[PDB]
């Protein structure tokens, strides 16, 4: 262990998206995750998942218009019906692709706008997602994003994500503990992993501080893995990093930790 999932939106980008499933399997991954599958039919993706015997661990609700500065519609006042549409489409994909969880994106708060109003809207949209997903035994994830990656995003600290989930008050809503953002904003990863065990349903990793391979940087990942084992984490660890160079050329860390 741990159980690693390759993030196809960041890894194996040398080839077209649809070809990354085979690339991940060739490297030895049993699961994959990515951001947005919407430009492809559920049939297209399902075929690649089955062909390569892969588990789809996670994906996101749509970002909206990225070039207009959007990164989620669920926290945007007046866009609630579009957010619900994004949530419903994600459910359609999650059902067809046998994916247990979806990260419902919040959104960027325009300068001058009241963040509280956006937060209230986000909480109601997460409750909507939670109630739509519960009957199918699926869950909803909330991911804090560091400012270096997404300026002015609704929330950047794991503690803000945790408080939001606590207020959402749903048994199938959890945070997405991306250690890259956590180390950039909060630190004390042991406290988050150990004392909030049960509150995060997914984990992601990347090397600090440049977000490349996880076998170097200020965080000693092998030690973190021991912690995850201790607390009995049973989910997947998404490898969401930008390879320093060619994806394959930087997979030494994987062979080591998976072969051990
Ligand atoms: Mg992430
Ligand atoms: Mg801090």
XYZ file of C-alpha atoms and ligand atoms in Angstrom:
262
model
C 0.000 0.000 0.000
C -1.199 2.741 -0.073
C -3.793 2.481 -2.842
C -2.723 5.034 -5.464
C -4.950 6.536 -8.168
C -3.302 8.348 -11.079
C -4.814 11.768 -11.824
C -5.198 11.813 -15.611
C -5.736 15.568 -15.776
C -2.184 16.082 -14.473
C -0.326 12.862 -15.295
C 0.228 11.236 -18.710
C -0.680 14.483 -20.490
C 1.830 13.531 -23.193
C -1.091 11.670 -24.788
C -4.776 12.513 -25.415
C -7.063 12.049 -22.405
C -8.745 8.915 -23.740
C -5.338 7.228 -24.073
C -4.304 7.970 -20.485
C -6.290 5.107 -18.986
C -4.126 2.573 -20.820
C -1.016 4.563 -19.885
C -1.953 4.452 -16.201
C -2.570 0.699 -16.302
C 0.710 0.160 -18.161
C 2.469 1.947 -15.294
C 0.726 -0.256 -12.733
C -2.099 1.897 -11.355
C -5.347 0.153 -10.405
C -7.353 3.358 -10.229
C -7.534 6.787 -11.823
C -9.155 10.140 -11.175
C -9.455 13.323 -13.199
C -11.247 16.644 -13.240
C -13.839 16.764 -16.014
C -15.146 13.837 -18.109
C -17.979 15.839 -19.702
C -16.444 16.315 -23.155
C -16.512 12.526 -23.532
C -19.473 10.158 -23.481
C -19.933 7.875 -20.484
C -19.669 5.011 -22.981
C -16.220 6.166 -24.147
C -14.817 6.333 -20.621
C -16.557 3.184 -19.395
C -14.935 1.247 -22.241
C -11.448 2.445 -21.256
C -12.072 1.674 -17.583
C -13.245 -1.876 -18.307
C -10.587 -2.486 -20.955
C -7.872 -1.563 -18.475
C -9.552 -2.977 -15.368
C -9.487 0.404 -13.661
C -11.502 1.886 -10.828
C -12.606 5.516 -11.189
C -11.914 6.991 -7.748
C -13.073 10.571 -8.262
C -13.945 13.441 -10.598
C -15.346 16.985 -10.356
C -18.527 18.830 -11.216
C -17.943 21.214 -14.164
C -15.884 24.432 -13.792
C -18.137 26.691 -15.817
C -16.279 29.136 -18.073
C -12.613 28.859 -17.053
C -11.588 31.736 -19.301
C -14.157 34.002 -17.673
C -12.400 33.215 -14.405
C -14.846 30.602 -13.128
C -13.833 27.512 -11.160
C -17.182 26.145 -10.031
C -20.784 27.336 -10.048
C -22.009 25.942 -6.722
C -20.866 28.966 -4.707
C -22.215 31.563 -7.147
C -25.421 33.463 -6.266
C -27.948 33.455 -9.095
C -26.402 30.418 -10.783
C -28.013 27.807 -8.522
C -30.068 26.176 -11.283
C -26.933 25.761 -13.395
C -25.072 24.360 -10.383
C -27.822 21.802 -9.832
C -27.536 20.911 -13.509
C -23.781 20.385 -13.028
C -24.447 18.243 -9.960
C -27.098 16.179 -11.740
C -24.810 15.553 -14.725
C -22.012 14.480 -12.382
C -24.405 11.967 -10.826
C -25.255 10.616 -14.279
C -21.551 10.085 -14.954
C -20.832 8.670 -11.477
C -23.590 6.085 -11.907
C -22.496 5.013 -15.397
C -18.802 4.907 -14.479
C -19.244 3.206 -11.100
C -17.615 6.089 -9.229
C -18.384 6.341 -5.503
C -17.579 10.029 -5.103
C -17.726 13.443 -6.739
C -16.014 16.673 -5.757
C -18.553 19.476 -6.042
C -16.582 22.585 -6.971
C -17.377 25.812 -5.132
C -16.225 28.864 -7.062
C -14.143 32.019 -7.179
C -15.400 35.048 -5.263
C -15.151 38.261 -7.342
C -13.310 41.158 -5.705
C -15.632 43.284 -3.587
C -18.243 40.526 -3.401
C -19.381 39.218 -0.014
C -17.819 35.802 0.590
C -20.441 34.978 3.222
C -23.242 35.092 0.645
C -21.266 32.733 -1.592
C -20.576 30.369 1.311
C -24.271 30.181 2.202
C -25.121 29.358 -1.410
C -22.386 26.713 -1.524
C -23.683 24.983 1.611
C -27.183 24.722 0.112
C -25.828 23.341 -3.168
C -23.727 20.766 -1.304
C -26.846 19.694 0.603
C -28.633 19.302 -2.737
C -25.772 17.195 -4.093
C -25.666 15.122 -0.899
C -29.387 14.357 -1.052
C -29.253 13.416 -4.731
C -26.236 11.134 -4.213
C -27.289 9.425 -0.970
C -29.922 7.087 -2.515
C -27.147 5.662 -4.691
C -24.756 5.167 -1.787
C -22.396 7.763 -3.239
C -20.671 10.648 -1.480
C -19.830 14.305 -2.052
C -16.411 15.827 -1.492
C -15.366 19.368 -0.612
C -11.849 20.476 -1.546
C -9.983 23.470 -0.131
C -7.646 25.073 -2.697
C -4.495 27.058 -1.877
C -4.290 30.641 -3.239
C -1.200 29.878 -5.308
C -3.301 27.441 -7.329
C -6.629 29.279 -7.335
C -6.651 32.918 -6.166
C -9.812 34.151 -4.435
C -11.398 30.697 -4.299
C -14.194 30.416 -1.707
C -12.013 28.629 0.855
C -8.351 27.623 1.064
C -7.863 26.009 4.485
C -8.730 22.427 5.412
C -10.355 23.889 8.511
C -12.684 26.000 6.371
C -13.571 22.878 4.390
C -14.166 20.941 7.613
C -16.396 23.658 9.091
C -18.433 23.824 5.881
C -19.011 20.056 5.953
C -19.972 20.206 9.640
C -22.607 22.836 8.783
C -23.838 20.901 5.739
C -24.781 18.167 8.233
C -24.949 15.131 5.939
C -23.648 11.602 6.497
C -22.314 11.345 2.949
C -20.328 14.585 2.704
C -16.588 14.690 3.505
C -13.553 16.802 2.723
C -11.004 15.991 0.042
C -7.664 16.204 1.850
C -5.203 17.330 -0.820
C -1.918 17.502 1.081
C -0.429 19.955 -1.420
C -2.998 22.595 -0.477
C -2.938 21.542 3.177
C 0.835 22.003 3.444
C 0.694 25.312 1.561
C -1.948 26.757 3.871
C -2.236 24.849 7.153
C 0.702 22.605 7.899
C 0.494 20.101 10.789
C -0.496 17.248 8.485
C -0.360 14.693 11.297
C -3.093 16.571 13.159
C -5.335 16.606 10.093
C -4.741 12.960 9.169
C -4.996 11.580 12.687
C -7.412 13.824 14.573
C -9.804 14.307 11.665
C -9.711 10.682 10.523
C -13.187 9.845 9.281
C -13.811 13.415 8.082
C -11.865 13.074 4.809
C -12.933 10.441 2.267
C -10.217 11.092 -0.282
C -6.574 12.142 -0.201
C -4.320 13.612 -2.884
C -0.583 14.198 -2.909
C 2.088 16.119 -4.794
C 5.615 17.204 -4.024
C 6.038 20.467 -2.140
C 6.603 23.231 -3.065
C 6.442 22.947 -6.872
C 3.802 20.204 -7.156
C 5.935 17.655 -8.995
C 6.755 14.037 -8.103
C 6.029 13.102 -4.420
C 9.453 11.560 -3.745
C 11.134 14.817 -2.766
C 10.237 18.186 -1.279
C 9.533 19.408 2.236
C 7.029 16.644 2.991
C 8.250 13.114 3.747
C 5.443 11.142 2.119
C 6.599 7.644 3.085
C 6.119 8.721 6.696
C 2.642 10.077 5.915
C 1.713 6.724 4.393
C 2.552 5.006 7.676
C 0.161 7.442 9.371
C -2.632 6.621 6.924
C -2.149 2.940 7.707
C -2.242 3.652 11.449
C -5.580 5.462 11.259
C -6.942 2.777 8.956
C -7.565 5.016 5.957
C -9.374 2.810 3.424
C -9.766 5.197 0.504
C -7.518 6.070 -2.417
C -4.582 8.459 -2.580
C -4.821 10.465 -5.783
C -1.489 11.411 -7.321
C -2.250 14.882 -8.581
C 1.030 16.441 -9.601
C 2.686 17.855 -12.700
C 5.561 15.572 -13.739
C 8.844 17.501 -13.721
C 9.446 16.132 -17.211
C 7.992 13.075 -18.945
C 5.442 11.250 -16.789
C 7.065 7.838 -17.209
C 10.542 9.198 -16.449
C 9.415 10.283 -12.992
C 7.565 7.164 -11.830
C 10.420 5.758 -9.758
C 8.574 6.734 -6.573
C 5.616 4.568 -7.591
C 7.569 1.364 -8.234
C 9.288 1.786 -4.872
C 6.201 2.360 -2.732
C 4.026 -0.176 -4.572
C 6.715 -2.843 -4.662
C 7.367 -2.496 -0.944
Mg -6.576 18.324 -5.518
Mg -1.602 27.861 8.942
